Amino acid sequence: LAKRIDAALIMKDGRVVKGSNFENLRDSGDPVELGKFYSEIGIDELSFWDITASVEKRKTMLELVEKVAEQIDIPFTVGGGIHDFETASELILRGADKVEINTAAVENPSLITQIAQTFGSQAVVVYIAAKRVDGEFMVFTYSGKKNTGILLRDWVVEVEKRGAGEIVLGSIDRLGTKSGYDTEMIRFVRPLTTLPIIAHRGAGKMEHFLEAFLAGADAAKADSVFHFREIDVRELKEYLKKHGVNVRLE
């Protein structure tokens, strides 16, 4: 397949957290308008991650999914506190193509299988946040607050066994940096799974995306570098095509 470029949007109370610099938009903090714009200039898939306070979270997330599905024609994923099958199910039925889970999947891996039984493996994305600890890649939950003691190597294999469709590999060792994706981690994981691997954390310039695809990533996901216009999505795709990467061009 072609290599995918994904844009992630953090959301709270129906707004893009910290907005975006796209002066041309009516509302640069409007997740729907911004995702529609990204879909027009060349992003392949969108991810939305909600951090709304529990009282309004369920209906805020369902309303977002509904508005996005009407307005955009590329696949999109929703996540943020999805803890059970009925919550994932209503978000998929309401419009999302995929649901993203992490901590809830670590604590109950059968939740992967439960969702895949009704919506297909392709509807399940498992985010794996990993960090070096004493020379081993370990899995972390609760926004990186908890070292689970589960080896990355073992969790990847279990996630595919349980029926997940894709893995987002987020390197806590690259959080808040602009040094590049964790290509050592990507090369570690690549021989362990047949599933699509989405690289996350570390992006600072176009060349980093090339490095991630040489490391075996099937997609690369970024956020602030896009929203704050440090990297132009069309220039990135032109750059990657120029140097031999198969990406989808318009």
Numbering used by the authors: 2 to 251
Paper text:
Computational design of KE07 involved construction of a theozyme to catalyze the chemical reaction, which was then grafted into the scaffold of imidazole glycerol phosphate synthase (HisF) from Thermotoga maritima. Catalytically essential residues from the initial design include a base (Glu101) that facilitates C−H bond cleavage, an H-bond donor (Lys222) to stabilize the phenoxide intermediate, and a π-stacking residue (Trp50), which was designed to stabilize the transition state and favor substrate binding through interactions with the aromatic ring of the substrate. This initial KE07 design (Round 1; R1) catalyzes the cleavage of 5-nitrobenzisoxazole, with 103-fold rate acceleration over the noncatalyzed reaction and a turnover rate (kcat) of 0.018 s−1.
Thus, the mechanism by which the remote mutations that appear in R5 and R6 increase activity is qualitatively different. This is mirrored in their location within the protein; in contrast to the initial mutations that affect the active site directly, the mutations in R5 (Val12Met) and R6 (Lys146Thr) are remote from the active site. The Val12Met and Phe77Ile mutations, also in the second shell, cause changes to internal cavities that cause a slight rotation in the backbone at Trp50 that also favors the alternative configuration. To the solution sampling of these states, we used HREX-MD simulations, which are among the most comprehensive computational methods to investigate conformational sampling. These results were consistent with the crystallography and kinetic analysis: whereas in R1 (original design), configuration A was the dominant substate that was sampled, by R5 we observe increased sampling of configurations B and C. By R7 and R7-2, configuration C (which was the only state we saw associated with product in the crystal structures) becomes the dominant substate sampled, with configurations A and B sampled only rarely. These simulations also reveal that the mobility of Glu101 was reduced as a result of the hydrogen bond formed to the indole nitrogen of Trp50 in R5; this could account for the improved pre-exponential factor from R5 onwards.
